[PDB]
Amino acid sequence: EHQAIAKMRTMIEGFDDISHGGLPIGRSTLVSGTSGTGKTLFSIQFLYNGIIEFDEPGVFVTFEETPQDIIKNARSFGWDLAKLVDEGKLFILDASPDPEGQEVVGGFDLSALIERINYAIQKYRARRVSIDSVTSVFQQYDASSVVRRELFRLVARLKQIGATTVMTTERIEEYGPIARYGVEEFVSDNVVILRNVLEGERRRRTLEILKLRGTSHMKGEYPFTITDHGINIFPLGAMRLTQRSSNVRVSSGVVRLDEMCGGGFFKDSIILATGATGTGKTLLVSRFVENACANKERAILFAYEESRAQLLRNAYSWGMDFEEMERQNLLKIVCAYPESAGLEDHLQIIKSEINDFKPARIAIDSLSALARGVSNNAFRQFVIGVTGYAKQEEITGLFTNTSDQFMGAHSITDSHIDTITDTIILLQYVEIRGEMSRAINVFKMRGSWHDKAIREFMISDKGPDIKDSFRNFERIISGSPTRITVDEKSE
Amino acid sequence: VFQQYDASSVVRRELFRLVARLKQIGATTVMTTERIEEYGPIARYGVEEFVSDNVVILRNVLEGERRRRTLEIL
Amino acid sequence: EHQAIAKMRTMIEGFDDISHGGLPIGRSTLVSGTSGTGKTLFSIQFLYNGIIEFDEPGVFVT
Amino acid sequence: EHQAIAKMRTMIEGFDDISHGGLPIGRSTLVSGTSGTGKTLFSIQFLYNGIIEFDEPGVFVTFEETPQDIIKNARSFGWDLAKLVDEGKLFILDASPDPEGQEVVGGFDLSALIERINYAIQKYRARRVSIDSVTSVFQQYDASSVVRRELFRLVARLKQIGATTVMTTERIEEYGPIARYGVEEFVSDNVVILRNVLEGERRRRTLEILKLRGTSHMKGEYPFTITDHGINIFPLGAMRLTQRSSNVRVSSGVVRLDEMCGGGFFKDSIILATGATGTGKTLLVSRFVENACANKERAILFAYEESRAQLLRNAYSWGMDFEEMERQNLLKIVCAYPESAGLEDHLQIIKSEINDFKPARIAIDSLSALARGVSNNAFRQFVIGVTGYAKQEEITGLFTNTSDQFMGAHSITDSHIDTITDTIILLQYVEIRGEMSRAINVFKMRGSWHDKAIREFMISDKGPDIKDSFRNFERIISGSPTRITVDEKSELSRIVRGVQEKGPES
């Protein structure tokens, strides 16, 4: 074998996108982290997937959790381990100790195990092996140097054998040593760290491939998720810039608006409506989500500010009946507090819900409601993920941004998502004769020509009624205009 | 190598031996040391640093979920 | 000799600039870093380039 | 000198100033620091200098480096310790352990060593002594209390012997303990600390004297660089404010300006030219450097924004041929990325180049270039340097500063260097009728009278042209003025009809 390194795929959604193929075969990969990070789960999902997708039987070596329990649990992702053991496809090699015993049995057993293990491998023609918390073993009474030699013996034996392993390790500090005895680190070929980062009373699991001897991979931490369908990672960087782009057009829900953008919204595009609280974005959305129903197309509305019932209210008050849209199963509403999760969990609920309703349109009411509390970068990373997924999937996107300062605003968006979007529809308050009058404007349309005027516009039980511009005013943008009333030429 | 059961001083004299002999032979060498904190000591035992005539440090700084590789000639 | 030290070129793209010539001849150089920084590589690349560019065989202790 | 302690001169550049004379005679100075901090140079150089300038034979004790190596390395700077060891002016005493050793030997060897050192000094009649890395000695198997006692002994025997020693030491953390065992700090008479602060990927070395039992000295960290000449410290705080001041005048390369300047810049003055990007500070400097050459003087240009090549294209397009300027051996251009070194370094490169050429005029294009990323307190401290040097050297200076915001800048400099400079020439854009026009202003001159007018100026192939002010304009500094007219049409040369000629004849 005189070729590059060969990698086996884990099938763990996203792990292989980052490990450029996955764990290198015949070698041991180290996946350590703190208590509650997925390690165990990972190893399992490793074997399982291997069995159910390539009939590669597997050996699972547990030094603490009991077989009955490793199974009991797995049923949490809808996995009947018991069966794979009946089918001789998975062998749970119990290595835990019993409530009674002796001592002074250091490496005495590290030599028997390697024999009980090679046993199950050969015997079950195993290709994948996962050793859970190898740490809990020398957690009998050992020091660094002692551990280094035992591991090296193990891995070595396993590399001789030819099995591809994954070793579970426990850490105590999220950013401190890689493994409890800062020794494993160098005893392994590959290293994967699972982190459960606090930061704000909110946690955020992130996975990282520190190293892959002999092959390349992706650097840095990647957010992931532990669900009923196991560990789901999102290589928000992996995503390529190869999204389909068509000239097809779509209605905005507002004829005059469609006219302004010169023919409408491109089917393949991201639309951003920015306005100081009260300018009626949530209106445009409602309207934009109704039009994808009169055309019997499916559409989801992700509101993060208002309730299910309230939306219905304010909706029926503008005409549009959302009651129907529900029944006709063409419109599906979500609603969730940004505080009921993290941007990682959210992005998934979105993506996920998209796949089960196959939307042709999607509206997220208040992106900035989602930027509540979270860091800037983390947020962008969130938009790129939703914005993107929506892009390469042919789903027209309309997201709502509520700037932090009514009147005067010197920038479309505070988070600077500007460049991340195709068409910018900007609403703004204008102070005329001591009254707070609205105005709408197509700031930028990438493909189309769109109108350049800043048009007045009111709201009634009929919805948005766009009017004329303020042709005879100065500094509109600022919010507090100044009528010109020029003495013509004065004859 | 000294991850058998050693302590600083025993590690110091031992490097010194190695390096030294290799100096006699007239060999231009490159030694590899493993660390535990991107900005902590320069090497596992806090001895190696001073012992060597030339030192090079390769780091993989984390920071903001991205890692950046840097190389420093101490 | 009886002058400043002389260096060996590493051909490791750039590094031979950051050291004003390369590793000093007849001496060791400690290259360290945490797991994954690229030491083993750097050590290999030093050897390889040695051979491949001046026919200066090398020894690799592992 | 009023100091109860008689000091000895190191001759290391500026250390003496910092130590108010140099090491105390008959005592020991702990020079400690991490790895690659300068320890061994300092020590070596300390003996060397005593040998070359005072014929004070010296003993050098090494515990790790080999006697062959201390010589080999020492050539790096240009010293032949070999020869000195030959004339018996420098005895190197080897105490490194062997490549084929044993274990145990650090107490009766400390006694044997003292007895050894006494010998060498007695035999060579030495007055200076170094001891490199005593630390590595107890680095066999010891603890705090055993070191203190073993140090004390050595130091005490040394002082009885009457020797002016220097001990080097290692530390782990740049800012934590002073030494390793945390006991060297209190058994030494003096403690000199060397640091190599990382901070933002670059590396800055400083030298600090924590204590001198018995005298005053300069408190705090001071920058220094290691070069082909050894250590070199800059007493950026010892630099007294007693620079010479004359009333002589020197052109600015541009006449009108000169007028505006009461009659041409002061020979002894720091000149500051601020303005938005594109205002033409660069231009002005070019003329200022040129003019010195047109009059047969030497002047250097340090450019941190433009290549030496481009600096010439633009310089020619503005007339003035810099090529010749390089040839006639009057103008010397530098060029250096500010990211290609720290401030301590750039400061010295400049100084050096200022010596090997004796300019009469100096012009640093874009100090705000050097301000990139550095901490203001570190930058302000750089400015003070270059500036100071130039003042106490009778070398006129023309510094450049580019403001982060074009039009609307409410401050001369974003680094508030304002008060360091003596004269300020301002440049800015003026939105006059859908057009960006340049305006030049002489904001302040310390010794002269200077015009208080914000003249408009246009840039051409010939260069700078200084017209007149926008008298009929309010909110000029706003960048985008407002035009109020109580007149305009007023005289100046009314008389209508056919006032001109055309290309044919007049």
Ligand SMILES: Nc1ncnc2c1ncn2[C@@H]1O[C@H](COP(=O)(O)OP(=O)(O)OP(=O)(O)O)[C@@H](O)[C@H]1O
């Ligand atoms: N069905 C599920 N839905 C959502 N989250 C789940 C589900 N099952 C488990 N989890 C989460 O995944 C984690 C399980 O981690 P697991 O026990 O597999 O290994 P570990 O945390 O890496 O190591 P350790 O053995 O110390 O716990 C739990 O902490 C829990 O929050």
Ligand SMILES: Nc1ncnc2c1ncn2[C@@H]1O[C@H](COP(=O)(O)OP(=O)(O)OP(=O)(O)O)[C@@H](O)[C@H]1O
């Ligand atoms: N029936 C109605 N008749 C007239 N105007 C209405 C009616 N309903 C709502 N409005 C107007 O629309 C506004 C409601 O805002 P909307 O739901 O459109 O979202 P928004 O202004 O973009 O964002 P947010 O609701 O978070 O402030 C009210 O402030 C009001 O001026």
Ligand SMILES: Nc1ncnc2c1ncn2[C@@H]1O[C@H](COP(=O)(O)OP(=O)(O)OP(=O)(O)O)[C@@H](O)[C@H]1O
């Ligand atoms: N072909 C490749 N392309 C891109 N990156 C690679 C390639 N091969 C290896 N790498 C990267 O280099 C790392 C390999 O580390 P390397 O073997 O150079 O030594 P080191 O980390 O300093 O020592 P050690 O890994 O033995 O603890 C991998 O972790 C990976 O990120």
Ligand SMILES: Nc1ncnc2c1ncn2[C@@H]1O[C@H](COP(=O)(O)OP(=O)(O)OP(=O)(O)O)[C@@H](O)[C@H]1O
């Ligand atoms: N000619 C030179 N020009 C510029 N820098 C030099 C020159 N020679 C040596 N250096 C620098 O000076 C340093 C030498 O340090 P030195 O030998 O004086 O003692 P140390 O680092 O304090 O202690 P140790 O001997 O244990 O390393 C090196 O870090 C190197 O970069």
Ligand SMILES: Nc1ncnc2c1ncn2[C@@H]1O[C@H](COP(=O)(O)OP(=O)(O)OP(=O)(O)O)[C@@H](O)[C@H]1O
């Ligand atoms: N030959 C020329 N003719 C007319 N105008 C010129 C000529 N050369 C340069 N200019 C003008 O001068 C400007 C160049 O700026 P200059 O090199 O003088 O330095 P600066 O504006 O102070 O600083 P920087 O170049 O770093 O922005 C141009 O933007 C342009 O308007």
Ligand SMILES: [Mg+2]
């Ligand atoms: Mg576990």
Ligand SMILES: [Mg+2]
């Ligand atoms: Mg490693």
Ligand SMILES: [Mg+2]
């Ligand atoms: Mg290695």
Ligand SMILES: [Mg+2]
């Ligand atoms: Mg050192």
Ligand SMILES: [Mg+2]
């Ligand atoms: Mg030294």
Ligand SMILES: [Mg+2]
């Ligand atoms: Mg310039």
